[PDB]
PDB file of all heavy atoms in Angstrom:
ATOM      1  N   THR A  59     204.515   3.949 148.208  1.00 44.85           N
ATOM      2  CA  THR A  59     205.232   4.416 147.032  1.00 44.85           C
ATOM      3  C   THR A  59     204.997   3.534 145.816  1.00 44.85           C
ATOM      4  O   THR A  59     204.891   4.054 144.700  1.00 44.85           O
ATOM      5  CB  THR A  59     206.733   4.495 147.325  1.00 44.85           C
ATOM      6  OG1 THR A  59     206.944   5.259 148.519  1.00 44.85           O
ATOM      7  CG2 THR A  59     207.473   5.161 146.173  1.00 44.85           C
ATOM      8  N   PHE A  60     204.897   2.218 146.003  1.00 43.21           N
ATOM      9  CA  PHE A  60     204.620   1.318 144.892  1.00 43.21           C
ATOM     10  C   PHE A  60     203.183   1.385 144.402  1.00 43.21           C
ATOM     11  O   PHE A  60     202.953   1.295 143.192  1.00 43.21           O
ATOM     12  CB  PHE A  60     204.952  -0.127 145.277  1.00 43.21           C
ATOM     13  CG  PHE A  60     206.287  -0.592 144.773  1.00 43.21           C
ATOM     14  CD1 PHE A  60     207.414  -0.489 145.568  1.00 43.21           C
ATOM     15  CD2 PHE A  60     206.415  -1.126 143.504  1.00 43.21           C
ATOM     16  CE1 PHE A  60     208.644  -0.916 145.106  1.00 43.21           C
ATOM     17  CE2 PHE A  60     207.641  -1.553 143.036  1.00 43.21           C
ATOM     18  CZ  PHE A  60     208.758  -1.447 143.840  1.00 43.21           C
ATOM     19  N   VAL A  61     202.206   1.537 145.300  1.00 43.79           N
ATOM     20  CA  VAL A  61     200.825   1.629 144.837  1.00 43.79           C
ATOM     21  C   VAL A  61     200.568   2.967 144.152  1.00 43.79           C
ATOM     22  O   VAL A  61     199.766   3.046 143.214  1.00 43.79           O
ATOM     23  CB  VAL A  61     199.836   1.380 145.993  1.00 43.79           C
ATOM     24  CG1 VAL A  61     200.044  -0.010 146.577  1.00 43.79           C
ATOM     25  CG2 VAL A  61     199.965   2.444 147.065  1.00 43.79           C
ATOM     26  N   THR A  62     201.231   4.035 144.598  1.00 45.12           N
ATOM     27  CA  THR A  62     201.043   5.344 143.984  1.00 45.12           C
ATOM     28  C   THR A  62     201.604   5.417 142.569  1.00 45.12           C
ATOM     29  O   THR A  62     200.962   6.006 141.693  1.00 45.12           O
ATOM     30  CB  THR A  62     201.685   6.432 144.848  1.00 45.12           C
ATOM     31  OG1 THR A  62     201.117   6.393 146.164  1.00 45.12           O
ATOM     32  CG2 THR A  62     201.450   7.809 144.245  1.00 45.12           C
ATOM     33  N   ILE A  63     202.775   4.833 142.327  1.00 45.98           N
ATOM     34  CA  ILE A  63     203.358   4.848 140.990  1.00 45.98           C
ATOM     35  C   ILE A  63     202.517   4.057 139.992  1.00 45.98           C
ATOM     36  O   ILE A  63     202.306   4.515 138.865  1.00 45.98           O
ATOM     37  CB  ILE A  63     204.803   4.320 141.034  1.00 45.98           C
ATOM     38  CG1 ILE A  63     205.694   5.279 141.824  1.00 45.98           C
ATOM     39  CG2 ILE A  63     205.352   4.131 139.629  1.00 45.98           C
ATOM     40  CD1 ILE A  63     205.774   6.665 141.227  1.00 45.98           C
ATOM     41  N   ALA A  64     202.018   2.884 140.382  1.00 44.10           N
ATOM     42  CA  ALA A  64     201.203   2.051 139.510  1.00 44.10           C
ATOM     43  C   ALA A  64     199.746   2.493 139.476  1.00 44.10           C
ATOM     44  O   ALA A  64     198.885   1.726 139.030  1.00 44.10           O
ATOM     45  CB  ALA A  64     201.301   0.587 139.935  1.00 44.10           C
ATOM     46  N   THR A  65     199.511   3.731 139.853  1.00 46.91           N
ATOM     47  CA  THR A  65     198.191   4.310 139.793  1.00 46.91           C
ATOM     48  C   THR A  65     197.098   3.438 140.408  1.00 46.91           C
ATOM     49  O   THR A  65     195.912   3.711 140.261  1.00 46.91           O
ATOM     50  CB  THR A  65     197.883   4.698 138.337  1.00 46.91           C
ATOM     51  OG1 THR A  65     197.960   3.537 137.508  1.00 46.91           O
ATOM     52  CG2 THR A  65     198.804   5.800 137.829  1.00 46.91           C
ATOM     53  N   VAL A  66     197.491   2.406 141.141  1.00 42.09           N
ATOM     54  CA  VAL A  66     196.492   1.544 141.755  1.00 42.09           C
ATOM     55  C   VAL A  66     195.653   2.321 142.760  1.00 42.09           C
ATOM     56  O   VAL A  66     194.451   2.121 142.844  1.00 42.09           O
ATOM     57  CB  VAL A  66     197.078   0.254 142.336  1.00 42.09           C
ATOM     58  CG1 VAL A  66     196.020  -0.545 143.068  1.00 42.09           C
ATOM     59  CG2 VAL A  66     197.719  -0.561 141.238  1.00 42.09           C
ATOM     60  N   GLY A  67     196.274   3.196 143.534  1.00 39.25           N
ATOM     61  CA  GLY A  67     195.514   4.039 144.428  1.00 39.25           C
ATOM     62  C   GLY A  67     194.504   3.456 145.388  1.00 39.25           C
ATOM     63  O   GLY A  67     193.333   3.818 145.319  1.00 39.25           O
ATOM     64  N   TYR A  68     194.913   2.511 146.218  1.00 39.50           N
ATOM     65  CA  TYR A  68     193.999   1.944 147.191  1.00 39.50           C
ATOM     66  C   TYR A  68     193.335   3.022 148.033  1.00 39.50           C
ATOM     67  O   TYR A  68     192.119   3.132 148.053  1.00 39.50           O
ATOM     68  CB  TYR A  68     194.729   0.968 148.103  1.00 39.50           C
ATOM     69  CG  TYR A  68     194.783  -0.430 147.558  1.00 39.50           C
ATOM     70  CD1 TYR A  68     195.945  -0.937 147.015  1.00 39.50           C
ATOM     71  CD2 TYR A  68     193.668  -1.239 147.585  1.00 39.50           C
ATOM     72  CE1 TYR A  68     195.990  -2.215 146.511  1.00 39.50           C
ATOM     73  CE2 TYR A  68     193.706  -2.517 147.083  1.00 39.50           C
ATOM     74  CZ  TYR A  68     194.864  -2.997 146.550  1.00 39.50           C
ATOM     75  OH  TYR A  68     194.896  -4.272 146.055  1.00 39.50           O
ATOM     76  N   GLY A  69     194.146   3.842 148.691  1.00 38.47           N
ATOM     77  CA  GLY A  69     193.649   4.892 149.558  1.00 38.47           C
ATOM     78  C   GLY A  69     193.624   4.557 151.030  1.00 38.47           C
ATOM     79  O   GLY A  69     193.042   5.321 151.810  1.00 38.47           O
ATOM     80  N   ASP A  70     194.227   3.439 151.437  1.00 36.27           N
ATOM     81  CA  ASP A  70     194.235   3.066 152.848  1.00 36.27           C
ATOM     82  C   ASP A  70     194.987   4.091 153.687  1.00 36.27           C
ATOM     83  O   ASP A  70     194.541   4.466 154.777  1.00 36.27           O
ATOM     84  CB  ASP A  70     194.851   1.678 153.017  1.00 36.27           C
ATOM     85  CG  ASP A  70     194.218   0.647 152.108  1.00 36.27           C
ATOM     86  OD1 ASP A  70     192.979   0.664 151.956  1.00 36.27           O
ATOM     87  OD2 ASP A  70     194.963  -0.177 151.538  1.00 36.27           O
ATOM     88  N   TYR A  71     196.134   4.521 153.163  1.00 38.97           N
ATOM     89  CA  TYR A  71     197.010   5.487 153.815  1.00 38.97           C
ATOM     90  C   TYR A  71     197.230   6.731 152.971  1.00 38.97           C
ATOM     91  O   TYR A  71     198.210   6.823 152.248  1.00 38.97           O
ATOM     92  CB  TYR A  71     198.370   4.858 154.076  1.00 38.97           C
ATOM     93  CG  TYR A  71     198.297   3.514 154.735  1.00 38.97           C
ATOM     94  CD1 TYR A  71     198.793   2.389 154.102  1.00 38.97           C
ATOM     95  CD2 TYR A  71     197.743   3.371 155.996  1.00 38.97           C
ATOM     96  CE1 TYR A  71     198.734   1.150 154.703  1.00 38.97           C
ATOM     97  CE2 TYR A  71     197.678   2.137 156.608  1.00 38.97           C
ATOM     98  CZ  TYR A  71     198.174   1.028 155.955  1.00 38.97           C
ATOM     99  OH  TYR A  71     198.110  -0.209 156.554  1.00 38.97           O
ATOM    100  N   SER A  72     196.342   7.703 153.098  1.00 38.95           N
ATOM    101  CA  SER A  72     196.435   8.928 152.326  1.00 38.95           C
ATOM    102  C   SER A  72     197.022  10.051 153.170  1.00 38.95           C
ATOM    103  O   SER A  72     196.827  10.097 154.389  1.00 38.95           O
ATOM    104  CB  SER A  72     195.052   9.344 151.808  1.00 38.95           C
ATOM    105  OG  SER A  72     194.484   8.325 151.004  1.00 38.95           O
ATOM    106  N   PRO A  73     197.757  10.974 152.554  1.00 42.58           N
ATOM    107  CA  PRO A  73     198.335  12.083 153.318  1.00 42.58           C
ATOM    108  C   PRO A  73     197.266  13.038 153.823  1.00 42.58           C
ATOM    109  O   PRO A  73     196.185  13.166 153.243  1.00 42.58           O
ATOM    110  CB  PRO A  73     199.257  12.770 152.304  1.00 42.58           C
ATOM    111  CG  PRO A  73     198.652  12.441 150.982  1.00 42.58           C
ATOM    112  CD  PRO A  73     198.105  11.049 151.124  1.00 42.58           C
ATOM    113  N   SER A  74     197.585  13.714 154.926  1.00 41.11           N
ATOM    114  CA  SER A  74     196.686  14.698 155.518  1.00 41.11           C
ATOM    115  C   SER A  74     197.266  16.101 155.598  1.00 41.11           C
ATOM    116  O   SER A  74     196.499  17.065 155.486  1.00 41.11           O
ATOM    117  CB  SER A  74     196.265  14.260 156.930  1.00 41.11           C
ATOM    118  OG  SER A  74     197.391  14.127 157.778  1.00 41.11           O
ATOM    119  N   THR A  75     198.573  16.254 155.787  1.00 42.80           N
ATOM    120  CA  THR A  75     199.171  17.576 155.825  1.00 42.80           C
ATOM    121  C   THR A  75     199.198  18.183 154.422  1.00 42.80           C
ATOM    122  O   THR A  75     199.291  17.460 153.426  1.00 42.80           O
ATOM    123  CB  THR A  75     200.588  17.507 156.386  1.00 42.80           C
ATOM    124  OG1 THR A  75     201.402  16.694 155.531  1.00 42.80           O
ATOM    125  CG2 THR A  75     200.578  16.907 157.784  1.00 42.80           C
ATOM    126  N   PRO A  76     199.093  19.512 154.316  1.00 38.82           N
ATOM    127  CA  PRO A  76     199.219  20.139 152.988  1.00 38.82           C
ATOM    128  C   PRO A  76     200.553  19.857 152.322  1.00 38.82           C
ATOM    129  O   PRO A  76     200.598  19.590 151.115  1.00 38.82           O
ATOM    130  CB  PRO A  76     199.028  21.633 153.288  1.00 38.82           C
ATOM    131  CG  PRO A  76     199.359  21.779 154.738  1.00 38.82           C
ATOM    132  CD  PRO A  76     198.896  20.509 155.381  1.00 38.82           C
ATOM    133  N   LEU A  77     201.616  19.835 153.118  1.00 38.52           N
ATOM    134  CA  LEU A  77     202.943  19.528 152.608  1.00 38.52           C
ATOM    135  C   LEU A  77     202.954  18.090 152.092  1.00 38.52           C
ATOM    136  O   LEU A  77     203.466  17.817 151.007  1.00 38.52           O
ATOM    137  CB  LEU A  77     203.996  19.705 153.701  1.00 38.52           C
ATOM    138  CG  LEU A  77     205.356  19.053 153.447  1.00 38.52           C
ATOM    139  CD1 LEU A  77     205.391  17.642 154.015  1.00 38.52           C
ATOM    140  CD2 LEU A  77     205.679  19.046 151.961  1.00 38.52           C
ATOM    141  N   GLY A  78     202.384  17.174 152.873  1.00 39.60           N
ATOM    142  CA  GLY A  78     202.321  15.779 152.479  1.00 39.60           C
ATOM    143  C   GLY A  78     201.536  15.539 151.208  1.00 39.60           C
ATOM    144  O   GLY A  78     201.941  14.722 150.376  1.00 39.60           O
ATOM    145  N   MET A  79     200.409  16.236 151.034  1.00 38.01           N
ATOM    146  CA  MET A  79     199.617  16.055 149.825  1.00 38.01           C
ATOM    147  C   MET A  79     200.218  16.761 148.616  1.00 38.01           C
ATOM    148  O   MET A  79     199.970  16.333 147.483  1.00 38.01           O
ATOM    149  CB  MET A  79     198.176  16.529 150.048  1.00 38.01           C
ATOM    150  CG  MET A  79     198.024  18.016 150.291  1.00 38.01           C
ATOM    151  SD  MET A  79     196.300  18.508 150.479  1.00 38.01           S
ATOM    152  CE  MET A  79     195.793  17.460 151.840  1.00 38.01           C
ATOM    153  N   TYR A  80     201.076  17.743 148.874  1.00 40.67           N
ATOM    154  CA  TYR A  80     201.789  18.434 147.815  1.00 40.67           C
ATOM    155  C   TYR A  80     202.852  17.449 147.334  1.00 40.67           C
ATOM    156  O   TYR A  80     203.011  17.232 146.133  1.00 40.67           O
ATOM    157  CB  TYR A  80     202.439  19.713 148.338  1.00 40.67           C
ATOM    158  CG  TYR A  80     203.190  20.488 147.279  1.00 40.67           C
ATOM    159  CD1 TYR A  80     202.656  21.645 146.729  1.00 40.67           C
ATOM    160  CD2 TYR A  80     204.432  20.061 146.830  1.00 40.67           C
ATOM    161  CE1 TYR A  80     203.339  22.357 145.761  1.00 40.67           C
ATOM    162  CE2 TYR A  80     205.123  20.766 145.862  1.00 40.67           C
ATOM    163  CZ  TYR A  80     204.571  21.913 145.332  1.00 40.67           C
ATOM    164  OH  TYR A  80     205.256  22.617 144.367  1.00 40.67           O
ATOM    165  N   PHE A  81     203.575  16.851 148.281  1.00 38.84           N
ATOM    166  CA  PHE A  81     204.584  15.850 147.951  1.00 38.84           C
ATOM    167  C   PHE A  81     203.966  14.696 147.174  1.00 38.84           C
ATOM    168  O   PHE A  81     204.617  14.088 146.319  1.00 38.84           O
ATOM    169  CB  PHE A  81     205.262  15.347 149.226  1.00 38.84           C
ATOM    170  CG  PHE A  81     206.269  14.258 148.988  1.00 38.84           C
ATOM    171  CD1 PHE A  81     207.544  14.563 148.544  1.00 38.84           C
ATOM    172  CD2 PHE A  81     205.944  12.932 149.218  1.00 38.84           C
ATOM    173  CE1 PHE A  81     208.476  13.565 148.325  1.00 38.84           C
ATOM    174  CE2 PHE A  81     206.872  11.929 149.003  1.00 38.84           C
ATOM    175  CZ  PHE A  81     208.139  12.247 148.556  1.00 38.84           C
ATOM    176  N   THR A  82     202.698  14.384 147.455  1.00 40.41           N
ATOM    177  CA  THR A  82     201.999  13.356 146.690  1.00 40.41           C
ATOM    178  C   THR A  82     201.832  13.772 145.233  1.00 40.41           C
ATOM    179  O   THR A  82     202.022  12.965 144.318  1.00 40.41           O
ATOM    180  CB  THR A  82     200.639  13.064 147.328  1.00 40.41           C
ATOM    181  OG1 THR A  82     200.834  12.579 148.661  1.00 40.41           O
ATOM    182  CG2 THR A  82     199.885  12.020 146.522  1.00 40.41           C
ATOM    183  N   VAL A  83     201.479  15.038 144.999  1.00 39.94           N
ATOM    184  CA  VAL A  83     201.356  15.539 143.631  1.00 39.94           C
ATOM    185  C   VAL A  83     202.710  15.517 142.933  1.00 39.94           C
ATOM    186  O   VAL A  83     202.817  15.161 141.751  1.00 39.94           O
ATOM    187  CB  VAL A  83     200.742  16.951 143.635  1.00 39.94           C
ATOM    188  CG1 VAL A  83     200.690  17.514 142.225  1.00 39.94           C
ATOM    189  CG2 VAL A  83     199.354  16.921 144.251  1.00 39.94           C
ATOM    190  N   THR A  84     203.764  15.912 143.652  1.00 38.58           N
ATOM    191  CA  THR A  84     205.109  15.857 143.086  1.00 38.58           C
ATOM    192  C   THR A  84     205.499  14.432 142.712  1.00 38.58           C
ATOM    193  O   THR A  84     206.040  14.201 141.623  1.00 38.58           O
ATOM    194  CB  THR A  84     206.120  16.443 144.071  1.00 38.58           C
ATOM    195  OG1 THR A  84     205.804  17.819 144.320  1.00 38.58           O
ATOM    196  CG2 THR A  84     207.533  16.347 143.511  1.00 38.58           C
ATOM    197  N   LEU A  85     205.220  13.466 143.588  1.00 41.46           N
ATOM    198  CA  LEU A  85     205.480  12.067 143.287  1.00 41.46           C
ATOM    199  C   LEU A  85     204.671  11.570 142.099  1.00 41.46           C
ATOM    200  O   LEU A  85     205.206  10.824 141.275  1.00 41.46           O
ATOM    201  CB  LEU A  85     205.181  11.201 144.511  1.00 41.46           C
ATOM    202  CG  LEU A  85     205.464   9.706 144.365  1.00 41.46           C
ATOM    203  CD1 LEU A  85     206.934   9.476 144.064  1.00 41.46           C
ATOM    204  CD2 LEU A  85     205.047   8.956 145.617  1.00 41.46           C
ATOM    205  N   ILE A  86     203.405  11.970 141.990  1.00 41.95           N
ATOM    206  CA  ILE A  86     202.576  11.551 140.865  1.00 41.95           C
ATOM    207  C   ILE A  86     203.130  12.086 139.550  1.00 41.95           C
ATOM    208  O   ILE A  86     203.249  11.342 138.566  1.00 41.95           O
ATOM    209  CB  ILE A  86     201.120  11.997 141.087  1.00 41.95           C
ATOM    210  CG1 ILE A  86     200.464  11.158 142.187  1.00 41.95           C
ATOM    211  CG2 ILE A  86     200.329  11.903 139.796  1.00 41.95           C
ATOM    212  CD1 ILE A  86     199.033  11.550 142.479  1.00 41.95           C
ATOM    213  N   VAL A  87     203.480  13.373 139.503  1.00 40.98           N
ATOM    214  CA  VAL A  87     203.992  13.928 138.253  1.00 40.98           C
ATOM    215  C   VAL A  87     205.361  13.338 137.921  1.00 40.98           C
ATOM    216  O   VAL A  87     205.666  13.090 136.746  1.00 40.98           O
ATOM    217  CB  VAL A  87     204.017  15.470 138.299  1.00 40.98           C
ATOM    218  CG1 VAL A  87     204.977  15.982 139.356  1.00 40.98           C
ATOM    219  CG2 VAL A  87     204.366  16.038 136.931  1.00 40.98           C
ATOM    220  N   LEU A  88     206.195  13.076 138.932  1.00 42.12           N
ATOM    221  CA  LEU A  88     207.486  12.449 138.669  1.00 42.12           C
ATOM    222  C   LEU A  88     207.315  11.023 138.159  1.00 42.12           C
ATOM    223  O   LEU A  88     208.055  10.581 137.273  1.00 42.12           O
ATOM    224  CB  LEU A  88     208.346  12.472 139.932  1.00 42.12           C
ATOM    225  CG  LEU A  88     209.819  12.113 139.746  1.00 42.12           C
ATOM    226  CD1 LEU A  88     210.469  13.053 138.744  1.00 42.12           C
ATOM    227  CD2 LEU A  88     210.550  12.157 141.077  1.00 42.12           C
ATOM    228  N   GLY A  89     206.345  10.287 138.705  1.00 41.81           N
ATOM    229  CA  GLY A  89     206.076   8.947 138.211  1.00 41.81           C
ATOM    230  C   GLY A  89     205.557   8.948 136.787  1.00 41.81           C
ATOM    231  O   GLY A  89     205.919   8.083 135.987  1.00 41.81           O
ATOM    232  N   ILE A  90     204.700   9.914 136.453  1.00 40.50           N
ATOM    233  CA  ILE A  90     204.249  10.045 135.071  1.00 40.50           C
ATOM    234  C   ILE A  90     205.420  10.361 134.146  1.00 40.50           C
ATOM    235  O   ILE A  90     205.523   9.792 133.051  1.00 40.50           O
ATOM    236  CB  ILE A  90     203.145  11.109 134.961  1.00 40.50           C
ATOM    237  CG1 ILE A  90     201.978  10.761 135.883  1.00 40.50           C
ATOM    238  CG2 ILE A  90     202.667  11.239 133.522  1.00 40.50           C
ATOM    239  CD1 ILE A  90     201.350   9.420 135.588  1.00 40.50           C
ATOM    240  N   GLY A  91     206.311  11.264 134.560  1.00 38.77           N
ATOM    241  CA  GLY A  91     207.488  11.552 133.759  1.00 38.77           C
ATOM    242  C   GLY A  91     208.389  10.349 133.564  1.00 38.77           C
ATOM    243  O   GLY A  91     208.909  10.131 132.466  1.00 38.77           O
ATOM    244  N   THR A  92     208.592   9.556 134.618  1.00 37.22           N
ATOM    245  CA  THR A  92     209.365   8.325 134.504  1.00 37.22           C
ATOM    246  C   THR A  92     208.704   7.305 133.586  1.00 37.22           C
ATOM    247  O   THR A  92     209.394   6.683 132.769  1.00 37.22           O
ATOM    248  CB  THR A  92     209.579   7.707 135.889  1.00 37.22           C
ATOM    249  OG1 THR A  92     210.510   6.621 135.790  1.00 37.22           O
ATOM    250  CG2 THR A  92     208.263   7.188 136.454  1.00 37.22           C
ATOM    251  N   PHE A  93     207.385   7.176 133.666  1.00 39.24           N
ATOM    252  CA  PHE A  93     206.687   6.255 132.786  1.00 39.24           C
ATOM    253  C   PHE A  93     206.850   6.693 131.354  1.00 39.24           C
ATOM    254  O   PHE A  93     207.057   5.860 130.486  1.00 39.24           O
ATOM    255  CB  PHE A  93     205.205   6.169 133.098  1.00 39.24           C
ATOM    256  CG  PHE A  93     204.844   5.010 133.965  1.00 39.24           C
ATOM    257  CD1 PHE A  93     203.626   4.968 134.618  1.00 39.24           C
ATOM    258  CD2 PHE A  93     205.711   3.951 134.109  1.00 39.24           C
ATOM    259  CE1 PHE A  93     203.291   3.891 135.412  1.00 39.24           C
ATOM    260  CE2 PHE A  93     205.387   2.874 134.907  1.00 39.24           C
ATOM    261  CZ  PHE A  93     204.175   2.843 135.559  1.00 39.24           C
ATOM    262  N   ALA A  94     206.733   7.991 131.093  1.00 42.01           N
ATOM    263  CA  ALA A  94     206.897   8.471 129.726  1.00 42.01           C
ATOM    264  C   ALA A  94     208.225   8.045 129.116  1.00 42.01           C
ATOM    265  O   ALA A  94     208.250   7.565 127.977  1.00 42.01           O
ATOM    266  CB  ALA A  94     206.779   9.996 129.682  1.00 42.01           C
ATOM    267  N   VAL A  95     209.303   8.172 129.884  1.00 40.34           N
ATOM    268  CA  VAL A  95     210.621   7.770 129.416  1.00 40.34           C
ATOM    269  C   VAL A  95     210.668   6.255 129.245  1.00 40.34           C
ATOM    270  O   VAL A  95     211.309   5.748 128.325  1.00 40.34           O
ATOM    271  CB  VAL A  95     211.726   8.207 130.392  1.00 40.34           C
ATOM    272  CG1 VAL A  95     211.285   7.983 131.830  1.00 40.34           C
ATOM    273  CG2 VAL A  95     213.016   7.457 130.099  1.00 40.34           C
TER     274      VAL A  95
END
C-alpha cells in the first residue's frame, strides 16, 4: 500500500485476480485524488 501510493511501483507483489487488479486501479485513482487535495 505504501509503495503503490508513492508511485514507486517495485512490482515484487503484483495482483493476479481481475478483482485484485481492479482494486489496484481504484487504489491508484484514490491515491491520486488524495495527492491532489
Side-chain angles (χ1 to χ4, degrees):
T59 308
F60 261 93
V61 300
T62 302
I63 294 299
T65 59
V66 175
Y68 273 105
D70 308 319
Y71 311 118
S72 302
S74 60
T75 62
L77 163 269
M79 66 178 57
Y80 180 104
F81 177 80
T82 299
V83 176
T84 299
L85 182 60
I86 288 179
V87 64
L88 192 58
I90 303 301
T92 189
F93 263 163
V95 41

